[PDB]
Amino acid sequence: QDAITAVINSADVQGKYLDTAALEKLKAYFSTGELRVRAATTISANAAAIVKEAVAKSLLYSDITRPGGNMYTTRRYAACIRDLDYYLRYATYAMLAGDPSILDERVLNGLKETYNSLGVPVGATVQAIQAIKEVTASLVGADAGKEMGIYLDYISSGLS
Amino acid sequence: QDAITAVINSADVQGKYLDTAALEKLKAYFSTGELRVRAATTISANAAAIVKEAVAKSLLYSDITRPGGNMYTTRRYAACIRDLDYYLRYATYAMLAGDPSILDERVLNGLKETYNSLGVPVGATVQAIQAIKEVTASLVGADAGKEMGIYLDYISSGLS
Amino acid sequence: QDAITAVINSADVQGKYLDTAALEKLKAYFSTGELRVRAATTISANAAAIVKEAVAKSLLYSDITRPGGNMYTTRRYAACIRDLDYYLRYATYAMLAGDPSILDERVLNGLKETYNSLGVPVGATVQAIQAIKEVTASLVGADAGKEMGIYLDYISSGLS
Amino acid sequence: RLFKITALVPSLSRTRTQRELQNTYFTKLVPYENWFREQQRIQKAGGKIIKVELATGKQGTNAGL
Amino acid sequence: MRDAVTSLIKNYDVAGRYFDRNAIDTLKDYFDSGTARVQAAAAINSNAAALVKQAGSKLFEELPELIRPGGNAYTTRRLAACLRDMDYYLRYATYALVAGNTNVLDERVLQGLRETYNSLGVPIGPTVRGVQILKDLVKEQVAGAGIANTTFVEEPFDHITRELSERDV
Amino acid sequence: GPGINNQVSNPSARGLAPGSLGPKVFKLDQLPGTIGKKAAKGASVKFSESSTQAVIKATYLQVFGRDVYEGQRLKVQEIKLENGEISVRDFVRALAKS
Amino acid sequence: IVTKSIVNADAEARYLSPGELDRIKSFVAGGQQRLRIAQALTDNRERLVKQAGDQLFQKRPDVVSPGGNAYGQEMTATCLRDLDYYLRLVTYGIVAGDVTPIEEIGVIGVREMYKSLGTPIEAVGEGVRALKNAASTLLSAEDAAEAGSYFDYVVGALQ
Amino acid sequence: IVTKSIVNADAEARYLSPGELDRIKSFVAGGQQRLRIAQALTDNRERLVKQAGDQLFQKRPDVVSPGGNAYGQEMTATCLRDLDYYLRLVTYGIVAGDVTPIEEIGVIGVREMYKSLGTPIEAVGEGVRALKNAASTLLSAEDAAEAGSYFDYVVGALQ
Amino acid sequence: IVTKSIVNADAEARYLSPGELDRIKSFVAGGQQRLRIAQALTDNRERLVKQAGDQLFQKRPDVVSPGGNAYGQEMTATCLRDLDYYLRLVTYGIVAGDVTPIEEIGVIGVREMYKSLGTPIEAVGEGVRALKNAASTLLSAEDAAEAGSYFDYVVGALQ
Amino acid sequence: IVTKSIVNADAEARYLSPGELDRIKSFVAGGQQRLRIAQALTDNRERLVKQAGDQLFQKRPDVVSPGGNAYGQEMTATCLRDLDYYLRLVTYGIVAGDVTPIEEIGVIGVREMYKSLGTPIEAVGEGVRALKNAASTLLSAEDAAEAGSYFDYVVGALQ
Amino acid sequence: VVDAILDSLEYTETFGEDTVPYERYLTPAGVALRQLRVGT
Numbered sequence A, B, C: 001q002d003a004i005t006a007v008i009n010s011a012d013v014q015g016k017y018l019d020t021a022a023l024e025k026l027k028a029y030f031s032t033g034e035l036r037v038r039a040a041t042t043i044s045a046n047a048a049a050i051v052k053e054a055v056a057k058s059l060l061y062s063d064i065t066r067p068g069g070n071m072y073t074t075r076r077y078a079a080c081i082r083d084l085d086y087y088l089r090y091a092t093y094a095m096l097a098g099d100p101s102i103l104d105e106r107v108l109n110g111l112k113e114t115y116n117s118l119g120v121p122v123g124a125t126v127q128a129i130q131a132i133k134e135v136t137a138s139l140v141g142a143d144a145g146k147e148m149g150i151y152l153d154y155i156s157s158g159l160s
Numbered sequence D: 001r002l003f004k005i006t007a008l009v010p011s012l013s014r015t016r017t018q019r020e021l022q023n024t025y026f027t028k029l030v031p032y033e034n035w036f037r038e039q040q041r042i043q044k045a046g047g048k049i050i051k052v053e054l055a056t057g058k059q060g061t062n063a064g065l
Numbered sequence E: 001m002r003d004a005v006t007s008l009i010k011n012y013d014v015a016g017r018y019f020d021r022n023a024i025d026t027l028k029d030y031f032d033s034g035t036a037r038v039q040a041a042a043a044i045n046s047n048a049a050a051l052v053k054q055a056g057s058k059l060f061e062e063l064p065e066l067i068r069p070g071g072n073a074y075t076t077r078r079l080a081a082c083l084r085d086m087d088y089y090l091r092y093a094t095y096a097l098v099a100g101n102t103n104v105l106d107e108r109v110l111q112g113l114r115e116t117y118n119s120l121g122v123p124i125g126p127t128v129r130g131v132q133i134l135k136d137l138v139k140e141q142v143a144g145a146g147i148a149n150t151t152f153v154e155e156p157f158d159h160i161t162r163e164l165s166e167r168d169v
Numbered sequence F: 001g002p003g004i005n006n007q008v009s010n011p012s013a014r015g016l017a018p019g020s021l022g023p024k025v026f027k028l029d030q031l032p033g034t035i036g037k038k039a040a041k042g043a044s045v046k047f048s049e050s051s052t053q054a055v056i057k058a059t060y061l062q063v064f065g066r067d068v069y070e071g072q073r074l075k076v077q078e079i080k081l082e083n084g085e086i087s088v089r090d091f092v093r094a095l096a097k098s
Numbered sequence G, H, I, J: 001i002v003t004k005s006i007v008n009a010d011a012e013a014r015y016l017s018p019g020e021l022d023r024i025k026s027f028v029a030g031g032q033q034r035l036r037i038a039q040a041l042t043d044n045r046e047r048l049v050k051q052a053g054d055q056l057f058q059k060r061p062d063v064v065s066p067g068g069n070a071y072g073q074e075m076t077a078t079c080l081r082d083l084d085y086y087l088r089l090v091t092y093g094i095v096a097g098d099v100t101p102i103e104e105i106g107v108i109g110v111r112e113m114y115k116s117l118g119t120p121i122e123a124v125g126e127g128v129r130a131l132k133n134a135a136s137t138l139l140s141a142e143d144a145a146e147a148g149s150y151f152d153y154v155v156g157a158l159q
Numbered sequence K: 001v002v003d004a005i006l007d008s009l010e011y012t013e014t015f016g017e018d019t020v021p022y023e024r025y026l027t028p029a030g031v032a033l034r035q036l037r038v039g040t
Ligand SMILES: *[C@H](C)[C@H]1/C(=C/c2[nH]c(/C=C3N=C(/C=C4\NC(=O)C(CC)=C4C)C(C)=C\3CCC(=O)O)c(CCC(=O)O)c2C)NC(=O)[C@@H]1C
Pocket: E060, E067, E073, E074, E075, E076, E077, E079
């Protein structure tokens, strides 16, 4: 769903026409879409650098990459990079849509089930998503970093 | 394959780059691509009415739709409708590509042997394709109509 | 003078207002100013490399740098580099102005007098300006290299 | 009722270190009902169809197939 | 139930870090919005019982079948229940006004709403329709007594809508 | 299988190997009844057929989950697949319509 | 159109490719013309339903005839209500820029609904064609083209 | 982008989407600028290839070392011809908008090929990166973003 | 850029001509983009110095070689500190909009300083070129153009 | 190698065919030579990592160069630790008799790990080749053949 | 249903025309009961 599609749905289930508050919501979305698109472009620029900096901030040189940790095996390191790239990409989609429903529908659906099945540590994942959020808020600026951090904190809060 | 990929493949067999002759072919393709898009919309509007008018003009009230003909049975009549619907759809695709090789590779690969083995008459199909050509030329326009008719006549020549 | 200032002057000496042909000239200048500025930036990047490549193309390993030639003494080699840097810099100014009047006013005024007074060879200077023009037309592209070569050939033609 | 097909389908993905020689070049009997979509799959994969033959059925049978 | 100040505390507690500049920025936003929020809640609290009656009046103006045979607000026994549900939606909207979140509406209103409404045969479309008669009236009342910007009054009714919503897109 | 070729991940790595973490796959190779060109056809051993019967075993093993009882093997489609016309996906289709 | 590019790049593991960002920026630019077209179709709805019923019942009189479905005042009121629904979905598709939120509510299961209601679908297609003609008369040329876009999608969908 | 959109709508049972038709419209609108970029890269073939190859030999002297593959005039001429081939495929990809011409002419089986030729992959990739830097310096700025991003696909796909 | 116009109109006895007021108003409008570009180069400094040292010591290994100046950990730390200084002055020039407060601190006497330090100036120019390449990879197209502006000024100044 | 035959006969519904029992009996016979080879590679590990770092940094000096990844004592210690890891996995594969417990821990996702670490994979392959050469010098002929077996698997895997 | 499962593209492209099908994915609960038991 969108913010546009959410506004249309909320006006639809009442049978209501588009009143002035919904037009205010759509015009606010059409105002913010500029920096939304620019932020999505520069996040699509260097996603690999963001994931590299995030694991170098949070996960590297810990016991997690040591033997016994969950990132010791090299296929598990590759799976870690894959999961962080997923979090960043779906946070980019939720930032450009302006509605976190795609995070609820595609990422946060059965994810705690999987992470408790595999024995994946949840707190280290939350700290890695936090480091992702700090790196991309530094990279994109504060004004779009707020909206990026909202959906990354949404993923972090639903994960916990 | 497109007209663009055909131009690129011709230059690639030569081993050179895209200089001014190929660039002028590409500018020509772009200028006709505008009206090609408009014709694709106006063809996808009433494809069912096109097939209906074509079979009503050509195939109905004849010996093949009578008992003792190829289009007598209800499953055979439905196969006839879906075959003419295909010829219209793939002529639309070959119109938008500007290139008939995708159309040839898609249907003219085996439809000759299939209509041979099933005992389907060829000339009635050629008449039906010509009726589709007249209906689409009357519906769309002059130059996009003859652009459609080039690939429809390519189908009718490939079946014969 | 500019191209803008030349258009304003040509409209002024008649007492004419700005008619549509002058507005066409100014709007063509405002269209071409983009690549004018980009070309001036990348020529200001590596002017020393252009002068080095030009003397390595045309003047080096000749009799001119041998004893008896005009570039034998090291102060004369430094004066040669200075003159070529002057030609490139004033050609950059004439390219960004879009009017060769500054070449006529600041470079080509009393230059043949000086070069025949000092015994400077004129044909070797013309070939050096030609090598400058080839190097910067390769470096900047063909589309701005045409306008760079126009003013460099203006210097070469006025020198001869 | 049964078609005797013979078709080749090349590999436009990455190259495979096992054969698929039965999968590239094949000749198989396909029923009449599945043959349209199975042909359409070969139509999709860009492969040539060499030989189509009705194995069992007779043309123009209105009842009993 | 989480406040607008306690939801930041939960978001910052799950990461284990301290307060930074951005959380202090949103706390300054909430703390200069609070004086206007309390006045808006007092103005809505004052005339609430008549708001419920006019919301019922315009709700029956919209769809006639609500007070007809094949409807749900037929007798007074079935009318008083619809009017106290109007009372409930206004009450928890004022709760969400002073809290500044939508978590009160989530946790106390919307969580079992589909189960009761499908259980009792109660419709959903006229319910959100009535919720918005309520918020048009509440916007008028807030604009009467002072407060110029009324978007924070505007949001909790819409959040109740979007979760009672039978989503078809 | 390997983690890195999750279908949600690499939509360009769907026909890859299952690795050594996944179960072991079955390709029908060495179709029995193609014994050279030169006239012969009087052999006994014919080692290819003993490996083709196991593909027929594994087809029952994955569609039905177990081996089927002795009285309910589909012998017609069995010998039709061994003859060479019906293929493995055709045999799975004709097995799932039993 | 943003959900289209997002699920399009979401099936892949790649980000949104910047050509898709260009199409989103261009749609963001054209959104003001989209909003004006939608408001112009919004405020003039009853004229469009009146002229659509006009042109339809002049074109096909069997719905008027008692064997047809739209016989009597109640059935003809339900008929014009259906045309009102389709005009509303066309305005939704005009704002959204791509035909997903109109196909999701009006197209995706319409054939079996109208088959188990008894009504023919070709008369509904002629009704949306009449709506397209009336809105083409109501709007300017560049507005009628962009409205006849989505009206054309509905007419192709109902057939 | 037309072939990829057609095969993507071919995998589904449906037509081309309004989003995809917007993509084709934007590609047509940018096509003339892409032909201008192809014009510049065609006319700068010589010096771009030579500067990129010499930047490669400045970075990586192992190939022109006598133990390396590109030892000798003929071997280094074939090295520059390989860089010429890749620049030609980059121009094809800039014109088409897809990377399917780059892919099915020069990407899809190049690892096994350069393994059997004895040539290191990473030095090819560094040479195409040098081509990216040179063509980035020649062109206009966001035009160079366009050219260098196709170059970026070739560089990332070779490794 | 305001001091430039002020001393420019101050050498004359005239006031500030209103075309200069137009350029000051336009710079005042673009100041927000300038501040975002400067903050983006600010927070990512150590990446830029790392990649600049990477590309420089790959390009010129004589500073690494013991005859060169930047031999050993202390000298290479002083080298990366010099690159940090030049990145800082580039951010100052990005905010100020004109190259005066960066030339006043980094350009105006640099040749005799680096001559009496023994270091070559061309290696410093290559280091600022590597900084420009890394910041071009870090920023968007319209941001990398406007950063490569002042980086280009420094590269032209050190030569 | 027993898990290989067990899952191999387990995908089928058949038992373990007695040719597989013959290969298990032969591996059981050769296990003593496998254990001696593994202990000989075990006790002499630091020699092998020393000579591997020797031959690698003589072969490829770019990891030593500051643009490369293994620059400085910490990064070169991490490099020799990686070589220690690969020698350990080679001893595991020597004992297990088949390359499954070494590919499961060192091969199956190594390309994307080393890509998102910045290191080149060809230098790691040259390091395992140097380990193979040093272990070939350390062992007898029939032992070096059987060690160069699994070392050869790792070298082919990293490429 | 069977004809539409085998008609699909996600069958023909992954399995192929001559491979016996095999289990490729499991549910998260389905791996919770499998791997995490007393002998992992
Ligand atoms: C007034 C002289 C006459 C009259 C008028 C009247 N009634 C209403 C509104 C309502 N009446 C009901 C009635 C009932 N609910 C019950 O359960 C029963 C028992 C059988 C009855 C009679 C209800 C539910 C309403 C409200 C909804 C509605 O509009 O119908 C009005 C409208 C009041 C208003 O504007 O709010 C009026 C004018 N009824 C009498 O008793 C007199 C004969």
